[PDB]
XYZ file of C-alpha atoms in Angstrom:
136
model
C 124.313 100.521 87.885
C 123.042 101.052 91.417
C 121.179 98.105 92.889
C 117.427 99.084 92.815
C 116.577 98.524 96.417
C 112.809 98.903 95.788
C 111.928 96.758 92.642
C 108.175 96.706 93.039
C 105.939 99.618 94.015
C 102.442 100.972 94.388
C 101.563 104.749 94.796
C 99.422 106.050 97.561
C 98.875 109.709 97.020
C 96.471 112.270 98.381
C 93.519 113.360 96.234
C 94.099 115.916 93.320
C 97.726 114.835 92.489
C 97.001 113.445 89.168
C 99.694 115.461 87.338
C 102.244 114.197 90.012
C 100.964 110.727 89.807
C 101.327 110.745 86.018
C 104.889 112.039 86.172
C 105.912 109.696 88.910
C 104.900 106.663 86.868
C 106.856 107.634 83.773
C 110.097 108.321 85.725
C 109.849 105.395 88.070
C 109.285 102.885 85.274
C 112.103 104.473 83.298
C 114.368 103.729 86.386
C 113.474 100.041 86.149
C 110.796 100.238 88.847
C 107.643 98.069 88.193
C 104.201 99.327 89.088
C 102.743 96.373 91.001
C 100.103 95.437 93.443
C 101.737 92.040 94.311
C 102.100 91.028 97.907
C 105.931 91.446 97.844
C 105.784 95.024 96.372
C 106.380 98.102 98.501
C 104.184 101.284 98.846
C 105.348 104.830 98.011
C 103.158 106.803 100.345
C 103.013 110.636 99.920
C 101.934 111.912 103.286
C 101.898 115.452 102.279
C 101.464 117.223 98.893
C 101.637 120.944 99.463
C 101.596 123.464 96.597
C 102.282 127.149 97.431
C 102.196 130.477 95.657
C 104.260 132.958 97.612
C 104.436 136.602 96.897
C 107.804 137.934 97.970
C 108.579 141.738 98.296
C 112.327 142.019 98.197
C 114.044 144.637 95.973
C 111.278 143.907 93.346
C 108.023 141.864 93.691
C 108.443 138.173 93.036
C 105.904 135.388 92.476
C 107.256 132.084 93.693
C 105.577 128.701 92.867
C 106.508 126.003 95.142
C 105.603 122.259 95.668
C 106.574 120.378 98.762
C 106.176 116.729 99.376
C 106.934 114.377 102.315
C 107.006 110.738 101.629
C 108.239 107.330 102.977
C 108.343 103.914 101.714
C 106.111 101.337 103.433
C 105.495 97.677 102.761
C 101.935 96.271 102.180
C 101.368 95.519 105.823
C 101.600 99.131 107.027
C 105.272 98.892 108.333
C 107.296 102.043 107.726
C 110.477 100.966 106.161
C 112.088 104.352 105.805
C 111.772 107.576 107.650
C 109.783 110.309 106.090
C 111.638 112.532 103.544
C 110.559 116.180 102.517
C 111.453 117.499 99.127
C 110.707 120.781 97.328
C 110.862 122.275 93.937
C 110.356 125.963 92.927
C 110.473 128.473 90.130
C 109.829 132.279 90.372
C 109.548 135.041 88.035
C 109.417 138.907 88.389
C 105.883 140.223 88.974
C 105.527 143.265 86.516
C 102.454 145.594 86.552
C 102.643 145.833 82.771
C 102.612 142.087 81.852
C 99.874 140.984 84.178
C 97.792 139.493 81.436
C 100.401 136.820 80.709
C 100.605 135.688 84.426
C 98.266 132.630 83.804
C 100.391 131.344 80.874
C 103.735 132.038 82.820
C 102.376 130.402 85.999
C 100.901 127.306 84.441
C 104.203 126.785 82.494
C 106.303 127.172 85.664
C 103.949 124.861 87.486
C 104.394 121.982 85.067
C 108.190 122.361 85.393
C 107.966 122.324 89.287
C 105.739 119.125 89.329
C 108.104 117.440 86.824
C 111.306 118.573 88.718
C 109.822 117.107 91.936
C 108.812 113.836 90.314
C 112.393 113.423 89.358
C 113.805 114.163 92.792
C 111.477 111.619 94.476
C 112.424 109.030 91.797
C 116.108 109.865 92.234
C 116.061 109.221 96.013
C 114.198 106.032 95.575
C 116.411 104.680 92.678
C 119.640 105.936 94.444
C 118.620 104.459 97.940
C 119.041 107.866 99.672
C 116.256 107.438 102.207
C 117.146 106.773 105.929
C 115.875 103.469 107.224
C 113.115 103.247 109.870
C 114.111 103.249 113.525
C 111.979 102.414 116.790
């Protein structure tokens, strides 16, 4: 197994990111990370959480649901220990004038999958130590 470089963590997230916070916790703990507030634990700071709903007119009309997140690990003294890392997840469906009623069900469904997908990528890069170290 890959040596878990960040054993103990705390999460600093912007407001209105409950769904992501929940998913990050299940996946982080699953990888052996321990949610801690101890003075030796690091801090997973999400600097940017940006959802987006693009309407793309190509051959056909397409609704694309994206979530983009920039984050970096910091210690409890404020020192940046890795450079920021920007990840994104997305799902899209074909907009159809007939099935417009279903939009809300379809979108909330695709949104839960996007958040989940992104929670797993964030967790992957931490557990797999794939974040570039900080540099002056």
